[PDB]
Amino acid sequence: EMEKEFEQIDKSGSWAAIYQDIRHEASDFPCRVAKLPKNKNRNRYRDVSPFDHSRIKLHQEDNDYINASLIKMEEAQRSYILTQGPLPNTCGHFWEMVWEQKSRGVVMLNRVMEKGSLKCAQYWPQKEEKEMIFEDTNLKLTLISEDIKTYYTVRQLELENLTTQETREILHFHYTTWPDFGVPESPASFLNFLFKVRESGSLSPEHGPVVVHCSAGIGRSGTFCLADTCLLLMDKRKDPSSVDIKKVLLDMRKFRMGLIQTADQLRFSYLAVIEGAKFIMGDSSVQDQWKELSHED
Ligand SMILES: O=C(O)C(=O)Nc1cc2ccccc2cc1C(=O)O
Known part of the structure; x- marks a missing residue:
């Protein structure tokens, strides 16, 4: 079990070692495009940087480049776009990618400000009177409404392709x-936040891939994504023990670098998948409990 493994690692405090092993083993593919001095x-x-083999190309003839990758989890049958937090000149390219990639979720x-520095553009309307228009890729975005929780906010955004005036609903989950x-x-x-996402449809295979971002992505x-896919995988087999969290990590590793930045993130991911195993193995009432402890309201 992964839980035996947790306590093996913990009892012999070797998270840092494990995680260096991971850094050790992770893939290295070309990022020639990212590094073009034009980008x-x-x-x-x-x-x-995004590997070239898995970067998202924009469907523009001018310069198809965005710092985003398609993480494609074939066994889980779940796929994600990870990307950096938008720069002031790439908010338009971000929304072009959501549009062409047909995502429902972001x-x-x-936060836009973390530790005194600006992590990310304010790339979505904070208020419904004040749409944003993205001149360079020809897209409108309007706040349609939000649901503020203590530790996260869900937003309904409308996104409009000004060229066709076709319209899509985007949900934006901000932890x-x-x-x-x-x-x-x-x-x-x-898990309460992850399960809000799931519930919303946005992780489901009739939509394009969810867009996930931090500041670096x-x-x-x-x-x-690691916690989500591990829960997916165990859910499909109902078999917690056929799930190798570290193998899953290195599999995601093939599609974008540096995924999980710290050994406490590694440890946290184990914690999240071990807990979530409760729900996946037929204790739906755990999910209530989550909502409660999380003090969402
Ligand atoms: O949001 C994150 O967890 C993240 O990936 N951040 C980061 C990851 C980094 C990884 C390598 C080099 C610089 C980075 C800088 C940041 C940052 O936000 O300053």
Whole structure:
């Protein structure tokens, strides 16, 4: 069991070692495109880039480049776009990717300001009188409404392709108490947030892939997706013990670098999947309990 493993690792405090092993073993593929000097100002961090083999191309003839990757989890049969928090000049490219990629959901795991510095553009309307229009990719976005919880806010956004005037509904899940390079307050809060996403349809295969982002698109986002896919996988077999959390991590590793940034994120991910196993193995009432402990309201 993964829980035996947890306590093996814990009892012999070797999270850091494990996680270095992971860093050890993770894939390295070319990012030639990211590093074209034309794309400099499309990348928020020198050292966080999309592999070429799995980057999202924009369907624009001018420059198809965005710092985003398609994480494609074939056995789980679940796929995600991870991306950095939008720069002031790429809010338009972000929404072009949501449009072409036909996503229903966007998961933000960061604040615009973290630790004194600006992590991310304010890329969505904070208020419904004040749409945003993105001139360069020709898209309208309007706040249609929000549901503010203590530790997260869900928003209904309308997104409009100004060229056809066709319209889509986007849900935006903003977790607001997940520290940069940190873990959530508890497994209950994270699982309550994850399960809000699931419930919303946005992780379901009649939509394009959910868009997940932090500021770099790697630490917090990796953690979200790792826990989600492990729960998916165990759910399909009802077999907790055929789930190798570290193998799943390195599988996601093939499609975008540096996923899960810290050993406490690794440990947190185990905690989240171990807890969530409760619900996946037929204790639906755990999900209530989550909502309760999480103090959502
Ligand atoms: O939000 C996150 O967890 C995340 O991935 N952050 C980061 C990951 C980084 C990884 C490598 C280099 C710079 C990074 C910078 C940030 C950052 O936010 O400052």
